[PDB]
Design a protein around this ligand. Sequence first.
Ligand SMILES: OC[C@@H](O)[C@@H]1O[C@@H](O)[C@H](O)[C@H]1O
Ligand SMILES: [Zn+2]
Ligand SMILES: [Zn+2]
Ligand SMILES: [Zn+2]
Ligand SMILES: [Zn+2]
Ligand SMILES: [Zn+2]
Ligand SMILES: [Zn+2]
Ligand SMILES: [Zn+2]
Ligand SMILES: [Zn+2]
Ligand SMILES: [Zn+2]
Length: 305
Amino acid sequence: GALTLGFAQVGAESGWRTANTESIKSAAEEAGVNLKFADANGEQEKQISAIRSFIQQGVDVIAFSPVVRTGWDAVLQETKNAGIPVILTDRAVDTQDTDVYKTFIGADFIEEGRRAGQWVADQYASATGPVNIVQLEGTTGADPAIDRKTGFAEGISKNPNLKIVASQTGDFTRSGGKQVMEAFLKSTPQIDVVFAQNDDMGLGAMEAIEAAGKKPGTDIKIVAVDATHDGMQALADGKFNYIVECNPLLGPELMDLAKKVAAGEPVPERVVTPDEAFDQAQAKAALPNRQYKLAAALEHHHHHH
Ligand SMILES: OC[C@@H](O)[C@@H]1O[C@@H](O)[C@H](O)[C@H]1O
Ligand SMILES: [Zn+2]
Ligand SMILES: [Zn+2]
Ligand SMILES: [Zn+2]
Ligand SMILES: [Zn+2]
Ligand SMILES: [Zn+2]
Ligand SMILES: [Zn+2]
Ligand SMILES: [Zn+2]
Ligand SMILES: [Zn+2]
Ligand SMILES: [Zn+2]
């Protein structure tokens, strides 16, 4: 007889996601929250069905990661009508209604993108010729994909030699990143750098660079967002060049907010998780007690009131 939480996950498309799923499950047990976890498997209709199912179960609070910004109108009005508060985690919505969710816990995707773009720009400062950028876009319609594109675009904007000569969705998967990169290796001859919006896509792209007998991290540079275990290991080994952290360990704050919310306590409208970036040497030093350092970084989150 404790707080009942219903979480509707996107799927398990990346390492970041699988880390997030573990953080949400583990944090619920330690907080003593009755979690009703649901895996949509990368399809919005199954997140919608899961949200509708949580109302019929009579849960105290609902939380989910909006796979894509649009198509939640009705489900959020059903929750507002049912009186179940809503918390958005790691992805935002595009809603035409007033007070449909309590707060959004996530990172500043535009700055994750800007920081990545400004690194490419800082590296190719003395370039006397053009520098060819390739871009592996995340799931079409997802809040981080749009924002990271817009951000990266701005970081690049202050250097005319940088040109995104190609850009295409890789669905935030390793397989998806491989396909699009092998397809780019055909269509584009000169590729200086690839900007993966999720290091799983950049890992698939790294396999495709190796498969086409080219040295990733030397011949073609890779810069990605997330800083997963595998992503961070590649950077530490020299296969990647720059990584911008997106912290998956929301579990603990998601519970704290779920309890505050459920008891009618005001919570800030935004909870922005921090970010940092690593070159190769930094990746080496950052790998050791990683999950402790990440949990420490989240306690330094900030609000927008
Ligand atoms: O907040 C970001 C999160 O929603 C994104 O989802 C994951 O697909 C991807 O790796 C990650 O960047
Ligand atoms: Zn576990
Ligand atoms: Zn409406
Ligand atoms: Zn308001
Ligand atoms: Zn956004
Ligand atoms: Zn691992
Ligand atoms: Zn960190
Ligand atoms: Zn706080
Ligand atoms: Zn505050
Ligand atoms: Zn801020």
